[PDB]
Amino acid sequence: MNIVVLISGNGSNLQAIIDACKTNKIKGTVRAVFSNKADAFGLERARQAGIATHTLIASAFDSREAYDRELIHEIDMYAPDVVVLAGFMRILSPAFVSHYAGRLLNIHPSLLPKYPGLHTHRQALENGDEEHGTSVHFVTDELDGGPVILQAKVPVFAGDSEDDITARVQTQEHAIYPLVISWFADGRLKMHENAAWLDGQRLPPQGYA
Amino acid sequence: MNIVVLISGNGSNLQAIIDACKTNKIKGTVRAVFSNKADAFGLERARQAGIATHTLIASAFDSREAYDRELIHEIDMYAPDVVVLAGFMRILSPAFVSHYAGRLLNIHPSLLPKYPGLHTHRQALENGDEEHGTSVHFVTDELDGGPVILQAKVPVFAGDSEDDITARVQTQEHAIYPLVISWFADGRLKMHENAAWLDGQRLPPQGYA
């Protein structure tokens, strides 16, 4: 079970994945870590774990197509069974999505379909939401990004700051992302016809419940 | 690509495999190492590499069936895509072979079908063979042990001690076992109907040539 993780920053989710592989909770290994930002601390987490790292900077390519062409080329050297987006903040082209159809995962910090874009925590707090959360989903060419596999909700209280909420959501992420990856590694989770199936059961719109 | 290696001694072949996974020559990872001997140095090589180790001593079991039942139970916790026998000096039962059918590899220190048993080096020298070598094969419940995938031959000269020939063959082992495993990891090597196939072609009785 070869895992390739794509990141853009801190890498706390990447770390939770690395940790779960080490305990064998995830019966697999992170073979390589890719980042579109050279200064991402996630690259350091990978280097300290003895994991191969690669960085592709946008300015080194003259088109989004060329960038993804090289990205696919480099990722495939590791023969990934699953490609995991963990804080990767760069849109992946349809060609990339198709190439890894059914084996591309993403984690989005909101209770989809709400706040499908950027600044999710900011929006939750400013709109005074009572609940917030995160969603792990299969990435497809669909307009909504793909079928949700699992969500985690967290309460939002009056005094909470954006950092308070962000950290609270990330704690859930560190738990559900490795869990979802373990379901995939175990062959229990599969994507088919733009739908997520767990243990042969078609999952509802907001994931396993 | 999860690899589980079974050993009984030194572990030099295990090391060559670990090294090839590290360089990504083998697009996979050794997830666990099993030994039927607590004193095997190979276990130290594994521990130093941060690889989970397990030892199953024969005296702790009252039947070959019970021993293999536990071995299967423990190996499966790592969800191996390939089980690699590298110096494992204990016969595996038909149930074990069947359980890992098509994904069980072994390396034998002789140019099969010659000297299919023990003390191969001793025999090659005593009979005055001008050639000796090693054979990697898929393990099946057949009388010959399974289809040969690849062999490596070494010349034998007058004046060579059993230690000389053994070391010479060992050098070839370290080259061909990781190669064969890389072919399996790349999806190029498959076992179909007790025969070995590389790139869709049925391999010769004595392996790839």
Ligand SMILES: Nc1nc(O)c2cc(C[C@@](O)(CNCC(=O)N[C@@H]3O[C@H](COP(=O)(O)O)[C@@H](O)[C@H]3O)c3ccc(C(=O)N[C@@H](CCC(=O)O)C(=O)O)cc3)ccc2n1
């Ligand atoms: N085909 C496809 N489909 C999706 O659904 C994608 C989903 C994402 C993630 C995200 O929705 C943010 N949605 C995901 C998100 O916010 N991820 C959160 O990250 C944290 C990481 O924590 P950690 O590092 O401690 O683990 C975690 O808590 C995790 O939940 C998304 C979308 C667009 C852009 C973007 O327009 N980028 C511009 C550049 C912008 C700029 O740099 O200025 C571009 O030109 O491509 C960036 C991110 C990225 C690529 C995708 N690609």
Ligand SMILES: Nc1nc(O)c2cc(C[C@@](O)(CNCC(=O)N[C@@H]3O[C@H](COP(=O)(O)O)[C@@H](O)[C@H]3O)c3ccc(C(=O)N[C@@H](CCC(=O)O)C(=O)O)cc3)ccc2n1
């Ligand atoms: N079903 C099945 N089929 C096969 O073909 C098997 C093939 C083997 C390997 C071997 O042929 C030795 N043939 C293989 C062999 O000699 N391996 C060589 O080892 C070196 C390791 O180097 P390294 O450690 O530095 O990497 C390398 O150069 C490598 O090629 C074989 C045969 C019989 C016995 C045995 O009768 N054992 C008794 C007694 C056990 C005891 O005393 O405890 C038993 O009761 O089971 C053991 C090994 C083991 C289990 C098998 N099981």
